[PDB]
Every structure is written in structure tokens, then in C-alpha cells.
Amino acid sequence: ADTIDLYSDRGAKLKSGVDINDISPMRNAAIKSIVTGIKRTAAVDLAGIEKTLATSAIGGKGRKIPGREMKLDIVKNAAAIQKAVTEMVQVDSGDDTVVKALNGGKQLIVQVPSVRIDVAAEYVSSLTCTASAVTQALVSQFNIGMFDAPTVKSAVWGQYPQTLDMVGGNVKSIVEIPQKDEGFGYTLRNVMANHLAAVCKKNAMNTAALCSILENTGVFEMGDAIGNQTRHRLLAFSHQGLNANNMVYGTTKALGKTGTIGSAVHACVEKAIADKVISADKKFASGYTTYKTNDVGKWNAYCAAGTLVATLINCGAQRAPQAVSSVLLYFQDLIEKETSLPGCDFGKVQGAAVGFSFFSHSIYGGGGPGVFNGNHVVTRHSKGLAVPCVAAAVALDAGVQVYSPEKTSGLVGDVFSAVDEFREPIKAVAGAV
Amino acid sequence: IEKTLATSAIGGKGRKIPGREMKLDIVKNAAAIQKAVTEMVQVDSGDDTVVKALNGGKQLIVQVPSVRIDVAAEYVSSLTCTASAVTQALVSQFNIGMFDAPTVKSAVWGQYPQTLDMVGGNVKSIVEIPQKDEGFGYTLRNVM
Amino acid sequence: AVRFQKAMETKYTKEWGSNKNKGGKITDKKAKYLRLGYQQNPRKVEMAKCGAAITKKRGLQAYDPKLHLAGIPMGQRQLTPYTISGTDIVCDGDDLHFVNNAAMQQEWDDIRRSCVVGLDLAHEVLEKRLGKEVTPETINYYLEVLNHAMPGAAIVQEHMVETHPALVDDCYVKIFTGDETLQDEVDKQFVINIDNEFPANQAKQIKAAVGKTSWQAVHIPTIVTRTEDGPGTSRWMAMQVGMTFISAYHMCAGEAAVGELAFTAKHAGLVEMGDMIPARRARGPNEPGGLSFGHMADICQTNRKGPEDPVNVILQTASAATMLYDQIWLGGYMSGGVGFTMYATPAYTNDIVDDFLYWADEYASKKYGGRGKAKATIDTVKDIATESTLYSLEAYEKYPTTLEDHFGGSQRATVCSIAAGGATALATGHSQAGLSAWYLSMYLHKEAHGRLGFFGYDLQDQCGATNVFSIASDEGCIGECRGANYPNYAMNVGHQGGYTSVVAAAHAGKDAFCVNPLVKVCFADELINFDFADPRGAFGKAALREWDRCAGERAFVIPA
Amino acid sequence: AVRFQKAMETKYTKEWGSNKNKGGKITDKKAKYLRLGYQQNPRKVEMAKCGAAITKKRGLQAYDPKLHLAGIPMGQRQLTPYTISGTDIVCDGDDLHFVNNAAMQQEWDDIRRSCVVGLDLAHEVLEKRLGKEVTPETINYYLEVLNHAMPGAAIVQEHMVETHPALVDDCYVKIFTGDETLQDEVDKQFVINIDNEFPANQAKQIKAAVGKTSWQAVHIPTIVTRTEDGPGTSRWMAMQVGMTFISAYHMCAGEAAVGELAFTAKHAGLVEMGDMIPARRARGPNEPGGLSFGHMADICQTNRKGPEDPVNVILQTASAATMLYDQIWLGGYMSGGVGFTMYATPAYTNDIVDDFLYWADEYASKKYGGRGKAKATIDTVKDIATESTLYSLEAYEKYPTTLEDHFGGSQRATVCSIAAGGATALATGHSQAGLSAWYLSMYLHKEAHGRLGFFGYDLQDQCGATNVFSIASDEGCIGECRGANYPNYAMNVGHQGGYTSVVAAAHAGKDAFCVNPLVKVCFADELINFDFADPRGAFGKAALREWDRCAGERAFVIPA
Amino acid sequence: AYKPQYYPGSTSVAKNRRKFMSDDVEKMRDISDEDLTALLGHRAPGSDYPSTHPPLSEIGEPACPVREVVEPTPGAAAGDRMRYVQFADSMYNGPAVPYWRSYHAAINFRGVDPGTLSGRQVNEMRERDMEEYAKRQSETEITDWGLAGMRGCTVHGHSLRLQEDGVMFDMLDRRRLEGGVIVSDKDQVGVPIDRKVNLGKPMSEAEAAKRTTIYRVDNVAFRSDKEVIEHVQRVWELRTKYGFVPKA
Ligand code: F43
Ligand SMILES: C[C@@H](OP(=O)(O)O)[C@H](NC(=O)CCCCCCS)C(=O)O
Ligand SMILES: O=S(=O)(O)CCS
Ligand SMILES: O=S(=O)(O)CCS
Ligand SMILES: [K+]
Ligand SMILES: [K+]
Ligand code: NA
């Protein structure tokens, strides 16, 4: 068995003597609540619909339809709209439907009732049932005539169904459409790093945790946490994402004034030796000694934690995100040179980091850290142990990036950050054990 | 799977890989494979997992436990957890060496991940992959 | 008079090749079936001789008219010509297949190889991250270097391979802007000047929509688009935009700011012609299935040159759009073989749809007290669509020559609904009203003749009326935003280009664009090889093998 | 002796153009930097004069070497040539860009425009539903009509438009079959005769895999594939296959049985080159991203002509595959601009990788007691990969001219790993073992030189060792079935064509095919425009502008 | 405290690699702050560092337990732009090799963003922090200014034959020999500057051979460093094995 203690985002002990099996996505009640909650949630931009209609800016990407402008006082009538949407989205009065106004009625948060995701293939009912309820509510509230109803519908839904997604629309989630998945199990991995930093209000520990919960739940859905992989996955998840034993936060604090990427590597090796995870194997004539491990899963988990420590201290020192690509690379390369043992994910964090560095500093694609995610072709390759560091690095930005969460993620960040378990996931996961 | 391996017909659509044939007594060992797959697919003993051999051991029905679809975006864990459990069970049952393990994996999973789907594989559902949906809400509508 | 009088006289009362047709009236009900075979037609004879020579040269059977079913070659009835509508250009159908007509291929290449990409966000990256000052002078150097580099030439490295200019002379970048100071200060060689290219009211409308924003109209090489695919266009653009920013702003040649420029060019600042479509018909961006009808209408340029004849705008749009959607897309990409030339030619030959649409617009404009004054209501739609359809059907019945030209019911249905839907959209300024009229026309037509189109023609037809004003997930959609991937429209000939003309009709002579001012200005450029203001004229010139603006050939690098 | 002696002397010790290079030794460590600029190179001068003429004719800036960064034109170091490996063809890098080289374009067109489609299921539909008897006589008539119809000609209807044979002479259909009686009774013009085209051992192995089944090798027109995309190929084929069955079997021209034939041609009986790829890089079937390395290796035909030199088979495969994957796919479809010619040219120029691979195969064949006799184990992989990599790196160090030719580390890494991986796969007959060697070579290389490739080169490299024998969902995959969409491989130059050569190495000189006998036989046909048995020779002939097999031009229908 | 061992090997190359990793490198020359700023090309020598965002003292920062315990660098606290230095190093026994410039950064400096390529190596940092790093690499044996150059673009040269004077080719001619010392009169992207910076005498070929971190068959052959080869093979073998089954 494997037992850990769970610590908060600021190093306070929350739970002692926790079986790692109890933080599994397949058992922990808070992971279930977070994942199913995200599947059920949509953001509605009522001010956005009002502006789209007033300017006939239907479909996005520069579009304007002359002659089709409509003036509807949507935000002013948000209370009546909210009521109508509630009644349409709910199945039974008293079910777990949520509809709440935010920001003076300019936005709604909608959580569809659970049955709309349980008796369904996917999570898209959160978008479609919300968009249909909003469209119907607007047509009723404003007595919209038949010849104008398609204008309202396209203001809400964007170009769908000409496009596969709601391009130019005003109903959105942090998750992307199913058809954009690179492969099996990638839906929960397709959450932009900027969105995650916004959901967690720039708390880097909580951002890493939310991203790690989604990434590792995705690894389960990929079929890659079965049998001889299950314990391996849970060790790395708990150590990197859930601050197991306070390794991430405590080491970050210890190294936070003078530490470099190299300091984090050395701290990881030192701790693995002290804890009997690795030990000297063969001494070469120069004095260099190779190390062996008695527990690949545990060594790997220590490396996963150390990779996040290095991100926090190096990107935290820059107060900027871009260096996360190089941190992820050089932590692994240096720890392998120091020990002759494989780095985190046996080369796959390093490899993801090589391509990520390239595709965040070149002409060919990518962008800043904030646009990446576990489904991105560049950053998908680690089994959940790279992108949590990316999201944490985004949270640490003091204002360097152009395509920041303020630019890319305002709607979904405002809505999804309202949900306590999404915003404060470490606390939630520990509360469930 | 047995026939795919014996004929190295890896990936379907006319394919054959010379020199990679493998002869495994899979159907005759269906009960042992079923037991290993059950332990891997289940989360907790006594949950709602089903694994049963059908038609003389030629097939298994697998129903993954509900938590694998509840704490998940889609339905594809039924395919992926089954394919991984079956691949692992075959490697252990037949003591398959590292250099031959990719052959077994591709016999089970087909051309995935070069292809989006398990083309030429041996684990299937009546529902198609989500990426083939014409639009929102179409997954349960994509049953031939 | 009827507008098709001349074309029907050319087609049937004058000999074509050696088809022995001479005299008679275009109202005559009987005809001779001379069974002359293919040798009556010089174009078929040229094809037959070419096929026989191929068979002999390669030692493997090629074209032979005697391989028709039953060994009975085409030309049992006489083989008769086409007149390009609005012109005196007379040709064979064979001169109008997309494979055989270089202007048709270039129309598609010029759409596929194009995208629009903003400048404002890119300049913001430079300002924010590097503190650079952007001026007309820095922009002018950027545009000079970009036009050198975009075709595939080097700016930064050494000992480099480059594309050969002789193969890529159709590739370039221009800019347009709502900022009038910038429009004046950028070197005029690079500028699509909105005030010069559009009438004053149209220019004002475009400027109001774009504000002070600035844009690049990018056209990558034809030889490249033909080797690759539509999704290659924005990628090609972005590589060379990125390289040019590096040089023009003295950046590290590959730093984090370059990555934010890449995301700008490839995503945040990018306007593609259309997006990807679903798996069954899998294609990425900048393919015809993803092209909305509003974008296709805005690519066409007749409205900026002749807004005083909105019917002509509609008809030219129908021509460009029907060729692309039915001949190249449905008849090519989505099927192939002999394909769908004649499903499309009713949009641009023999002046028949033109007669019907001019008639219906005259009817509506008189009835409603001037053009464009009808209210968008059930009663207006019912009136215009019914009276138009009755005129059009009666014309086919009064002129047997027109019925024989549009020998397939699908052709007749398309023609009638273009007239009814186009006249309705023009009368109301309302694309949805136009679609409703399109469908009512079809329903009347079916009952009048006891037939409509081919086996599968009216799938969208029968879904049509109910889905015009539906708000369902995959049914609701304003007309301008519908396109070749709108579910009901995703399969069948006879509709996509017609709907594009209906969308155009809701704006022709009234607005400068239908859905996207950025697309509209992009194509307002005489340097683009295909003349989007006069697609009929380009099709006709190329039918005569006289159109001289083909790009992308490999002649320069192969033997004579 | 080293195989690259001659090529390095041509490149550096003999003048090229007016570059003033003369004398010296290929081992010399120092060089002259004459700063002659582009005027030293006739090809660059031709380009510059073309660019200036374009600028003047169109009134918009085009190519100008003076628009290089800092106004310092290329040719500060001397501009030096390339020799096509295994030949005496000497050319400029500019003659090897895919845009400038018609054979390279035609290689891709010939893959994109091709598919294989069974006959057995279609014949079963006819037998089951109609009770038809299928005989050699009915098949021969079917194939005659099909070859008339496939390019786009009519067989059922009347007054039809057709494609012009002069534009589509590269389109045809042949058949192949494991049924030896049918192979002899079909008219020889239509047959790819497996016994004629393959050595007896290879023919036997193909026939064992295909049994008695029969297949159509279909090649749709190049002019069409260039207008359209890869997903158009099977659709074009199926339209004309369907038409021909209707005529050849006296069917209703559109009945339920025709629908089951359509499903047969388009799905159940169809072998495409590859399937669709995911949304970020959205493309449908028959595009390079979906092409598995096993299929690409089987398209290449060197192994049926010269199996006695398996190293040459590997090298020719590397040449055809690296050109496609790096120049056209990664450097075109997935990016563009100047692109990736020189990332690819190490596979097919200057005899350097050839030296290294011949050396490593000699090492392994002697050590393990004959070619192909090494066991597929960690110890074998470690040995061959280490000793190969040490040889290769020491060669770059002993011969400064080779280091300067392969001036980018990515080029050097690709060359080393082709040699190490190819020799290991050839020694073991095992594609997985070859991939494991590829990655060990990279790791050694990085430590030797303190550098490897470009910024993002070793993404797959560092994932590589651990993913060779992984069984994870999106990591496990037998080598033959990996391709340009295997996740780790989906982005970067220097690898895809190399892996294709490693896959080929596991089978060269031993097996008739790597993964698909149907693909193998399809391309065993001299009528295909591109010579898949000697891609290096085709590239070289086209580099000289002398290659005469280009298809798809519009010359016949445009003015001079 | 844990004493790092860094890297295997007993050859001079391996020892020099460990010197780079531990910042145990000899100072070879002096370069003034203003001369370095001139070479870097990001602002006028002696001028204030531009900002990309306001200083942390002006705007404060969101509540984050990590921000509370991780000290911003001086450049981060001030809001400096992210700027860079980029070097190209000859393969003919240039003292540095790209990966080892990056290890030097990652081990010895807070708040780095290093990138390794074959023909260029780069580090992006907040501007004032970057200058400290650039000075250390430029003044020590990490750089020989004949065999290396500061090149933010047009980097071609690392793998080319040396000039007859022993200096690595620069297409843009940013630095060259004059009077027995290297001088530089352009910034790193080729813009002429109004000063001529003296970068010292280049190392002799013999000193370069002794100080280099590259292996070469005609100096210190990689084949001879049996410890490094064994290390590479061990990491490869373990990555391979654990990818099949993640078990010791
Ligand atoms: C701007 C970038 C960053 C980026 O995203 N792409 C670039 C540039 C781009 C441009 C260069 C065209 C031009 O000269 O204007 C193109 C041709 C892609 C395109 N846009 O068409 C390209 N690189 Ni690059 N690029 C190459 C290479 C390389 C090598 C060059 C090292 C040297 O010593 O010259 C290095 C990477 C490394 O160090 O490993 C490199 C860097 C870089 N590469 C640096 C510029 C380097 C510089 O400032 O000089 N490329 C190569 O290593 C060989 C192949 C070569 C490609 C052209 C071809 O294949 O024909 C080209 C491929
Ligand atoms: C990363 C991704 O770009 P985006 O991040 O989606 O813009 C992707 N490009 C690539 O993979 C480019 C590959 C070719 C150029 C680099 C070769 S090393 C694509 O365009 O789909
Ligand atoms: O006859 S069908 O309607 O099926 C096809 C018409 S092209
Ligand atoms: O310099 S980069 O490695 O980003 C690109 C090389 S073409
Ligand atoms: K309800
Ligand atoms: K289990
Ligand atoms: Na094409």
C-alpha cells in the first residue's frame, strides 16, 4: 500500500494517513463532483448577445450582416430571462439545476441538471440545452416575430451548424467540442491553460491541482491507468497535483529566495536518497556514481513534484510564464545527468518540453504557454505530468503575455471561478477523504 | 485477435506484416483471460463490472464499472480500458517479451493512434467514435 | 420580349458544326432526330481523335465514343451549343467542364489560396513585448520584404533554397484599412484603396464596419495550392508573415514574442474563407464545403461595379457560386467523373434564368411601389413566389426549346427557385424571406409538372419550409451564415449557388457586403487572376481557350 | 575509401558558376569567404532577373535578393552544388525545392490520385442480387469501358459534357489478381502481372497474402487531384466504377443493387493510402499526414528491381519518403514558404548517408555472421547503434566538407539515425529494433557534440526510447503501422522519411512488402508517371528541367 | 548539503562540462556594462530599462501562496521587458557547446528561459537580469570571441570551415579580428553601432582544444569517454524498459 498526507495550497496539513487509492479519480467524491460539474456548466454572455444583435455581428471573425440589427434590452431584463432559462433547463423543480446571474446580469452561470449528462453520450448538453433555453427565452421575452427568430438564434449559437462549433456565439465552456479530440480520452485534456489560471484566480497551487485533476482523469479515460499502470499514475498525480506530503509547496518555499532549476533538481535527488527511493549503484573511475531505484513509481512521482517546484521557483522569479517550457526540459535532462536514472515520465516530459519550447519561440505554431493544453498536439505527449506546470506558470504572470487570461478567458473564467470546488480543488479533494 | 496475430494481419484493409506472425492459444484460454480482464477493469470488488465469455470463448462482453463513465467526459473508456486490459492480459498470460508486445497491442487496438479509430482492431462498440459526430448530440445517433 | 430569344435561335435555328439544324421557330413543338452521331460536332471529333492517339501511344484503352452503352454513340439527337448569358460567346458544353476550362479552375484556386490577416494585434505584440514603434515607414518596409518573401524567398539565413519567381508570380500581399491616414501613408503599390474601389456609399458602409482596423489580403502561390490543399493557405501565409516581422522589427530570429506573433497570424488575427467540416466529408479550412453563402456572395465583385443593376449582380453571383459549388465541389471533390457541368450551366447560359428573374423583379417592384420596398411577411413571400413560379413554368411550356435545353427537372427547379427566391430577397432585403420563397416555388413546381428534380433533389426542399424559421440546434441559422455544410444542404446539386444568389439578392444594390466586409475588400483587386466582377465573361473567354490569366503551370521547369 | 569523396570534390574543390572554388582537399579545415553575393550563381541570377521583371510588369514588389535582412544578400559564403546520390547529376539546391521540381510534385500527385478497390465483393453483389454470371469476357468489357469512362467520359446518357482526353491521359485502371487463371484470361493491356513484375520468391509471397482475390489499381487524373484534394480520389473512382457496372451488366441505371455497389466501391472494397487525421491538422483520406510508413515503403518499388542491394532499397525509400514527408507535407501542407528542401536533401544528395549506412550494414553483417541474422534484443540494438553512430560522427569530424554540407544539426542527426536504425532493422528484420536504435543514436549524438537538432527536433527523440515498446493507448504501435499522425511524430522534420526507411530496412531483400501487398502491387506499373523504383533518378532529371512525364497541365486549353 | 556530481567522465571535455555546470569558469576579459548593452541592442547604453508592465510595488499582485514565498528577480519586480542574448559557437573546439550554455543558465541563475539548438543558443530573461547572465558568459572562458559570436539572427557558421584567420564566419560581419584582437561594431542583429568594442585576443587553437566542451576525433574523441557512453546507454535502456512496464 501507499499512504500520504494531504496539505493545502499553503502547506497546512489537511488530512493524515490517506491511502492513495482514495484520491483516485475512480473513488474520490470531490474529483467526481469537479469533473461532472465541469461537464454540466456553461457560461452565457447576455451582454454579448445584446451587442451581437445591436451590431448584427453575427458569426464572428469580422462578420456584420447589414440590415439585420436588433435592439433588445437583454441585460435590463436579465431577471425574467434567468427565470425562464431556469424553468427550461431544469427537468424537475428541485433538481440540481443552477442558474445564477453574475456581473449585474451581464452573464449567467448555468449548470444543467445531472440527468442531462447522465442520460447522454457526452457533456455537450450543457452548451446545447443552455443555448436553446436562452434562445427560446429571448424570443418569448421580446415577442420576437418568426422572420427575426433566426437572427436571434444565430446571435446565441454563432455559425452552428455551418460550423461544427458555436463560432461567434455567446454560450461557452472551458472544454472544447468532442470532435477536436486528438484521440480517445482527450476531452477533459482540452482545457486551455489560460482558462485554468482564470478559474483558480491566479493561485498557482490551485491552478496546478485543477489542471492535474483533469489531466489525470483524462489519462484514466484514455485507458492508460489500468493494471500495471494504476499505482504509477496515482503516485505522480498525488505528488505533482495534490501537494502530497507537502513536497511541492514545502520545497518551493525552501527554494523560493535563492533556488534555480538546478537547485530543484538537487533537492529532488537529495530527498530521494534520504527517503531510500534511490541508492548508489556503480561507481565509475572518475568518482561519478550511477543510481538505482527500488520503486520506479515513487522515483517518477518525486521527479514530477520536483518539476513543478522548479516551475514555481523559476517562473515565479520571472513573474512570467514563458520559461515553463525550458524548466520542464532542463529539470529532466539535468536529473538524468546527475543520477543516470530516467527523468519524469521516462523522457516524455522532456520531449513534450522540447517541442513546447520550439512552438512557443518560433514562427511555426503554438503561442505563449496560455494557449497550450493536454490535447494540444505539442503538449499532449506526457501522461498528465507537463500541462499542470504550464497552467501554474500562467498563474504567475505579472503582465508579460499578450494573449493572457484577461484576453482569452474572461467569460469562462468569470463564470467557472464562481464554483468553489473548481476554484479551490485541493481543499475539495482532501475534504472528500 | 488470435487470427490477426497468427496471420500478422495487423491493421486491416489488406495488411500483412511479414515475419511478425505469433501463434497464441487465446480462445482455449478464454477463462483465464476473462479473470484477468475482470480484475483490471473493475475498480472495487463488488462494483457493477461485467466480463463474460460468449460463444465458446470466441468473444467477451465487457461492461466497465459505471464510475469509468461517470468520472469521464464521454463513453470511450469502455473501449480503451477494455483494450488495455485485454492487451495486458495477453502479454501476461502468454509471457510475451518486450520486443513482441507492440505486435500484440496493434492486434488488439488496430492502427490506433496512427488512425483516430481502432481500424483493424478487435474491440468494438455499436457506437462510433465522438470525432465522427456531425454535430452536437449526435453520438447516440451514430449506431448503424 | 423574352431574354432567351437570341440564345434559343443560336441553339436550334442555326447550324452548329454539321448538325443540320436550320430555321423554324423557338416555339415549335416537334424536332428531327437525325442520328448523326458524334461526328456532327467538331469538339467531340477533336476529343475522339485525342483519345484514339492516347490508346495507341500508351497501349491501354482511352476515350472512344463507341464505348457508350449499346454501342450507340452520343449525338442521336443533335448536339447543340450554349451562349454565355449576357454575351455573344457561343461554345459547346464541353468547353464549360471545370476540367476543361482554366478560368473555372482559377476561380477556385484564387479563393482557396487566399486569406485575410489582421495587422493590429501583431503590432500590439511588438509594442507590448519589445516596445517597438510602428509607423507607416516600418510598415512600408515590412510590406516590401513580405512581397519578396511570401512566394517562398529567404530573408534571414544563408545558402538557402528558394521558390523560383517565374513559378510564383501570382503570389502577393496587399493591405486595406479603415484608418484613412494609414491608407494615405502606405506606399500605394500595396494598398487596396477602399475609396477608389467602391462607390462612396459602399465605402462608407465598409469603413463603418471595419472602424480603424488594418488587414492584409494574402494570396499564396497557385502552384502551391494545387500541390497542397486549402488548409495550407493560412499556414503558408503565417510562416512568411512571421519571418518578415523578425527582419522588419529587428527581433531575435525566434524568441517568445515571435511565438505570440505566430498565434496572431494563425489564429487570433486570421480570417479564413471557411472552417473544417465533419468526418464523413472530412476537409480542413478553405475548402468549398466550409464556405458560407455569405462569404461566397462577398467574394463576388459585381455589386461594386454595377449596383444599379442588382439583378445582374444576383446573376453573376449565381454564376460564380453555382460553378464552384456544383461543378468543382459537388461534381468534383464530393463525387467526380463526368460530373455536374449541366446541373450548373443554367445559372450562366442561354439567358433563361435571367429572363425569369428580371420578370419576377419587375413584377415585385411594380406591385410593392418600388424595388426593395416589400415587407418581409408570409403574404409577400406567397405572392412573389407564386406569380414568379407561374411565369417561369408557363415559359417552359410556351417555348419547347427552353424545356429541351433544361432537359433535367433539377435544372428547371433550380432556375425557377433562383428567380422566385432572388426576386423575393431583392424585394424585401431579407435572406430568410428569399429562402421561404425558394421552397414555395419548389412545392408549386412539383404539383404543376408531377415531377421535380432527380431522385434525391428535394431532400432539402421538403425539409426546407419548416427549417427556414426553425430555431433548433442544427436547423436555425440566418441565411447569410448558411453554407455548403448546413446539414440539409450538405449533399445535393442545384441549390448551393442558388442560395448564394438569394443571399446576394438581399443586399444587391443596397449594401456593400452581405456578411463580411473583410472578405469583400480582399477580392476588390484587379491583380487577382480570376475576374470576380465578371465571372461569366471569364468563363466564356476560357471556353474559347483565349483566357490568358492561368497561374501555377510547371512549363518553366519542364521540356517544351 | 568514403562514398562521398567525389561529391565533396564536386561541391568544394571545383568551381560552380563563378564561385571561384578551386583545388584544396575535402579534409581541409579552413575555407575562403569571398562575399561574391548571388551573382556567383547563374540560377540565382535567373531568379533575380525574373523577380525584377515581375515587379515591373505587375507594379508590385516581387523577389529581390537585396531584401535579405541587413541588405546583405545570400552568397557571402560561396554557393555550392549538390550531386544526386548514386549519380553524376549535379545541380543547385534551388532545383530540388518541391515547387521547382516537377518530378517531386508528380510523386505526390501519383500517390494522392491512387487507390485500390476490390472486385470480389462487387461481383458478389451482381451474383446475389441479379443472378449475373461474371466471366473473363464480362470483366474484359467492363475494363475496356472503365478505361474510357474513368477519366470523365459518358456511357449511359445523351448530349453530355465530358472531360477532354487531351487533359486526362494519365488516368487509367489496371487489375491484379492472385487467381492465376484470371490473370491469364484478362486482356493483357489491363493486367499488372505479378509473375512478370516480381522475382519468383516475391511473387509467391504476394500471392500467398492475397489468395485468389482480385483488385483494381485506379489512378484518377492529375489535373483533378490538383484542383481537388486526396479525399476526392476514392469518390471519383467510385462514380465511374458504378457507371461501368451498370452498362457492363445490363442493370437498371440506378437500382438498389447499384447502391450496394456504391457502398462496395466507397467503403467495403476500398483501400485508400491513408485515413483522416484530427481537427487541429484536419485533412481527409489520401493526404500525407494519414500515410503510414509501411504504406509509403510499399509504394516505393526499388525492392522488386534490386533486392540484392537492400541498402540501396533503403536509401531510395528514404529519398522518396523524405521528399514527400518533409518537403511537401511538413514544409508545404503544414507550414510553407521557403520550407524544408535542405532538411530533406541529406536523404538523396552527396552520398553521405549512403556511406554511413553501407558502413553500418557491413559492420553488422560481418559481426552477426551474415546479413539479417542478428537477434532482436537490447544487446544487438545497443551494439549496432553505438558503433554506427561513432563511425558517422567521426566522419563528420574527419571531413569538414561533410559537416559544412549538413550544416544544420538536424540534418546530421537524421543522417546518423537513418544509418544506425536502418542497419539495425536490416540486421534483425525487426522494425521495432530499428526504431530503438534510431533513438539511441540521437542520445549518443547529443552528448558527443553538445547539440542535436533545431529547437524542437528531439520532441519525438526524447519520448522515443520509452515509446518504442510501450503498450499505452496512444503510444503502442508496431513500427509498420506508425506514420505521420503517430502522436509524437505529428509535427517535426527529419524523422518521417527516415522511419519509413527503417521500416523498409526490416523487409528489404527478405520480403516482397512491409505491410500491404495491395499497395505494393498497385505501384508496380511503368505507366505511372513517377518512377517509384528510382526516385533519385527522377528527382535529378527534373532538377535539370529534362524530366518529361509531368501530367495535369492546362496547356491544351490556354493560349501560348 | 547534497554535493552534486553533475555529469560522468574523466576526459578534459567532461571536466570542462562540469566547470560550466558549476560556474567554475575562468574570467578572461573585461567588458563594460555600456559596451555589453550596445552589443545586445535593446536600449541605449546607460539608459533606464524600459518596462512592459508597471513595477510590482505600484500594482501589487494577486493572492497566491507561491508568489508569497518566491522572490521576484530585480527585473521582474521592476517590470522589465523579456529580452535575450544569443550565441553561436564553432564546432572547431569552441569552448562552449549549446546544451552546456543552457545548463550553465539553469543551474546558476534564477529566472531563466534557455533554449538549445545546433547553430544558436539563447536565454530570455527580464532585461536587467539577462545582462548579468550575458556578462558572465561573455567575460569568461565560456566564450571565445573568435570561435563564437553574439548573433540574434543570421547565425550560420558553427558547422562551417573556419576562416583562414581562425575566426568563425559571420554573414553579417558583426565582429572580426583587428590588430590581433576581436572587435565588434554592430549589435547582435546586425545594426551598426557607434562604438567599437574590444573583445580581446582569441584563444590559440591549442588553448581552445584544452578548454572545449565538444568531443572531436582529432582532439578528445567521444569514443574514448567510456563513462559518458555507458551513461547514455544506461539511460536509454532504463527509459526503454520502464516504457514497457514501469517497474524496477
Ligand atoms: C527564424 C528561425 C526561427 C524559426 O522559427 N525558423 C527559422 C527561420 C526559418 C525560415 C528561414 C527562411 C529565411 O532565411 O528567411 C525557413 C526557411 C522556414 C520558412 N519560413 O520558409 C526555415 N527556417 Ni530554420 N531552417 C533550416 C535550418 C535551421 C538551423 C540553421 C543553422 C545554421 O547554422 O545556419 C537553425 C536551427 C539550429 O540551429 O539547429 C534554424 C533557425 C531558424 N529557423 C531561425 C533563424 C536562424 C538564424 O537567425 O539564422 N534553422 C537547418 O538546420 C537546415 C535546414 C534549414 C531550412 C531550409 C531548408 O530546409 O531548405 C530552414 C527552414
Ligand atoms: C502546432 C500546430 O500549430 P497550431 O498551434 O495549431 O497553430 C500545427 N503546426 C505544426 O505542427 C507545424 C509543423 C510543420 C512546421 C515545423 C516543422 S519542425 C498546425 O498548424 O496544426
Ligand atoms: O438518377 S438519380 O437521381 O439517382 C442521379 C441523377 S444525376
Ligand atoms: O530555430 S528553430 O529551431 O525554432 C526553427 C528551425 S527551422
Ligand atoms: K423543463
Ligand atoms: K483494477
Ligand atoms: Na490540391
Residue numbers in the entry:
A (entry chain E): 2 to 434
B (entry chain B): 50 to 193
C (entry chain A), D (entry chain D): 2 to 561
E (entry chain F): 2 to 249
The authors write:
Biological samples were retrieved from Ooijpolder (Netherlands)31,32 and Vercelli rice fields (Italy)14,17 and cultivated in bioreactors for >5 years, significantly enriching ANME-2d with nitrate as an electron acceptor. Both MCRs crystallised in a monoclinic space group with similar unit cell dimensions. The subatomic resolution of both ANME-2d structures enables the visualisation of the majority of hydrogen atoms and accurately depicts the position of each ligand atom. MCRs from ANME-2c and ANME-2dO contain reduced coenzymes trapped in the active site (i.e. CoM-SH and CoB-SH). The substitution does not impact the F430 position and provokes few steric displacements in the vicinity. The three studied enzymes have seven post-translational modifications, among them was a novel 3(S)-methylhistidine on the γ-chain of both ANME-2d MCRs. To our knowledge, this is the first report of a 3(S)-methylhistidine in a natural protein and the first PTM identified on the γ-chain of any characterised MCR.
Here, we obtained the true atomic resolution structure of their methane-capturing system (Methyl-Coenzyme M Reductase, MCR), circumventing the isolation barrier by exploiting microbial enrichments of freshwater nitrate-reducing ANME-2d grown in bioreactors, and marine ANME-2c in syntrophy with bacterial partners. In the proposed mechanism, the heterodisulfide, made of Coenzyme M (HS-CoM) and Coenzyme B (CoB-SH), would react with methane to generate methyl-S-CoM and free CoB-SH through a radical mechanism catalysed by the Ni-containing tetrapyrrole cofactor F43019,20. Despite their physiological differences, these ANMEs have extremely conserved MCR structures, similar to homologs from methanogenic Methanosarcinales, rather than the phylogenetically distant MCR of ANME-1 isolated from Black Sea mats.
